[PDB]
């Protein structure tokens, strides 16, 4: 069957760039040509013992898209799941004897890795564990660029905001870097900036990079404009105000960008993007959003169904 | 019956023994290994004299043998230890300590929201020599450190 | 040509020897009481046979000797053991084990709401006997628990 | 001066015969004559890690009927608690600097012997240690039945309820068993029985002690009745309503009973003492919470003044 049958999507860096295309190609062609009973007979677990409404939405959404049959909890003291001392491990090992596949979302950071060792034959999904891997939310992002751009390789990509612990940003930074001729532009403040080892990374694949201060400075030449969310618990109120300052986009500072730029981000950007901006033909979040759809389609219809699509 | 002495000080036979050990590092192997857990004989020395100016423990476990992705292991603790097979020194290689590229079941990762810590896995943590440093990743969390921090906690 | 006298540099030294001590206890005193932490030298021998169907473990450690009531702490794990204050047999008449009325810094309170276990403190247990057990008693809960519970923690 | 001058009052039974005539010997006297001012100067710190309301406001008033101040918290879950990170190690470290004398209240048996190494010359006075020891409820008991029946020896008790779980009456039961010809009658449900090793150290000491299924059996020989209350918890529903006959007390039970007989409680006896108990002369339960503050004015003043009152 296809590359990824019956395989546990748990890490972007476990993806060869080979996997990424079919990934993607098989996103595009159920775009296209749904295929609302690809999954009839399939029973999923969306398990979010970490609650995620959007995240949440969207993979479960995928899976009806799909014709699968859902089951799940978001474990936020919602269930009564591992009062005392119940492992992680034997709730795998429970409900993956009912289910065809689970789909989760933890605190932790080695959650679905774990989940993977006492899920015998069931396929998991990694939906976020903690602050380490994010697989689908690093594939619907690629996805909108290919979309949008036409390709993956030679482009500018400027990424801003809390780019040392937006883990979304480095999950895509490295994805990206998995592509030739790509050029990065890291806007950040100083106390959230690109992390060494990612940078590490960039200059043994020789790829260019460069650290800005300010979007307009690097307008110009970008092509996916990456706006990050930058959590106001993070820094100092006061260091917030202080630097928030342009780190926040603006219609205004679109004048001269790119007939062809897209401005992402991972979703919630109340403090980041101006209403203004929704307007703009650049504004591509919500797309984005939407493209969350066919991405997980994609990936569960590659883990579950043997032949490709069509 | 061929064997010769009642000795409980220093003896020999079908069985491995660890050389060069520095000290404070002997006992610490015996329990993140649980070579004790054995049947078979085990005789150790530790404190005693090294090499005409130090110190250094001594492990001589008889009636068992060690592997190439074992002996290693001993690496990021006992690198400098020799390790001669002596069913009667029937040795092959320079058999010395090399980086193993993962070690597994001894060490703790220092990231306290690491998953490994309150479930029925074992540790397991990929190797990278560095300058003045080694850099171990967890299997689990994905995070790196440096042995100095996983050793410390 | 002779070599006459009956020695090979081996057993000689004015420190203490613990012998006869049930197997796999060996390796549980040397940690439990912390005794290869010391820089002076230390003779194990695990699983060396001594006569009768049975198991046994030795060790010894040199220019220390223990005290009267640190050997008692080797009653509950090593019943009947013997020792042998050692620069040439400084043992007293007999020394023997015997039970220590009080237990401290080894055992674990078995009772999780103890205060015991988050805290600064050491261990500390009341020694008492009754047939088929022994009575501990913890200083601080001051629940009474069967050493068979208290040492399968 | 006294015996008890300056030392920790952690556990019933670190109090010998003593001890105990000579608490009962100063509630007494401070009873008869008031000493507002005995100590005028002092500062003492009511630390209820667990709250305890009752004891709490008969502590703290002890503290000012002899006018000393009061500091202290009802950490209930509304303190800056150590967020699980700082000991109660270093919290009496840095609180026995401050006072001159603790009184604490704690979850965890043994909580006040380890404050007891921690502080400095400054002594701690056991409010209550989990399921430990509650050494002034024992005080007040005693006290109780002394002014009552004119002595602590020779005397017929009985104890209903939950002599399994209810410490309270293990602890009397010690205290009293310092004392000679004493009789006791045990009345409880199998399932909460007196436990074995109380029995052993009666037999040990020549004491009598005799089971009974009911309080009428007993009534006609009692000079204490000790009701315990019954947590429904326990026990399943079903279990607590089936056993709950009769080890619940009503005045027609009270026909028989001896002039002096005095019917004692911990209190928490909504379950236990029906209200028409109340009027007949042998309740004597809130008489006894009254004397909870002569017997802890008495630990207060031996362990911080030197000399005798009265
Ligand atoms: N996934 C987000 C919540 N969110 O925005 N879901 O759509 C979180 O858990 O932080
Ligand atoms: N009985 C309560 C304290 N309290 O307020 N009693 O009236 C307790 O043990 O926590
Ligand atoms: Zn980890
Ligand atoms: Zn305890």
């Known amino acids: 069957a296809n590359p990824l049958y019956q395989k546990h999507i748990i890490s972007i860096n476990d993806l060869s760039r080979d996997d990424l295309n079919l990934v993607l190609a098989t996103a595009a062609k159920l775009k296209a040509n749904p295929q609302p009973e690809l999954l009839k007979h399939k029973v999923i677990a969306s398990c979010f013992f970490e609650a995620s409404t959007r995240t949440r939405l969207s993979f479960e959404t995928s899976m009806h898209r799909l014709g699968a049959s859902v089951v799940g909890f ?33 605190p932790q950071e080695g959650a679905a890795r774990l989940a993977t060792e006492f899920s015998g034959n069931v396929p998991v999904l990694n939906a976020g564990d903690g602050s380490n891997q994010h697989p689908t939310q690093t594939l619907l992002d690629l996805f909108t660029i290919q979309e949008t751009q036409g390709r993956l390789d030679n482009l500018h990509v400027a990424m801003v905001g809390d780019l040392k612990y937006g883990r979304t940003v480095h999950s895509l930074t490295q994805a990206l870097a998995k592509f030739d001729g790509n050029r990065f532009y890291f806007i950040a403040p100083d106390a959230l900036a690109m ?116 | 019956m061929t064997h010769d002495n009642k000795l409980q000080v220093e003896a020999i036979k079908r069985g491995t023994v ?16 649980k070579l004790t857990e054995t049947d078979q004989r085990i005789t150790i020395g530790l404190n005693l004299p090294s090499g005409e100016m130090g110190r250094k423990d001594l492990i001589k476990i008889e009636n068992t043998f060690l592997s190439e992705d074992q002996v290693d292991q001993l690496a990021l603790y006992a690198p400098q230890a020799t390790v001669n097979r002596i069913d009667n020194y029937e040795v092959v290689g320079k058999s ?42 967890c299997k689990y969390c994905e995070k790196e450190f440096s042995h100095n921090v996983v050793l410390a906690n």
Chains 1, 4 share one sequence.
């Open chain 1, 74 to 106: 978001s474990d936020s003291a919602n269930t009564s799941l591992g009062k005392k001392g119940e492992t992680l491990a034997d709730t795998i090992s429970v409900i993956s004897t009912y289910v065809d596949a689970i789909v989760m979302r933890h």
């Open chain 1, 195 to 310: 992390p060494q080892y990612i940078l590490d990374m960039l200059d043994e694949k020789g790829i260019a990079w460069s650290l800005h201060s300010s979007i307009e400075e690097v307008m110009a030449e970008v092509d996916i404009l990456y706006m990050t969310r930058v959590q106001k618990e993070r820094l100092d109120p006061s260091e917030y105000a202080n630097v928030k300052a342009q780190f926040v986009l603006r219609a205004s500072d679109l004048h001269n960008a790119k007939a062809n730029m897209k401005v992402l981000h991972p979703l919630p950007r109340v403090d980041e993007i101006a209403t203004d901006v929704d307007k703009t033909p650049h504004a591509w979040y919500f797309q984005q959003a939407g493209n969350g759809i066919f991405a997980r389609q994609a990936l569960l219809a590659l883990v579950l169904n043997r032949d490709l699509v069509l």
């Open chain 2, 18 to 33: 660890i050389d060069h050990i520095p000290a404070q590092i002997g006992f610490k192997l015996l329990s993140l290994f």
């Open chain 2, 96 to 137: 010395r300590p090399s980086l193993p590229e993962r070690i597994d079941n001894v060490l703790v990762c220092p990231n306290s929201n690491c998953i490994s810590h309150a479930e029925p896995v074992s540790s397991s943590f990929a190797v990278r020599k560095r300058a003045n440093d080694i850099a171990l990743k």
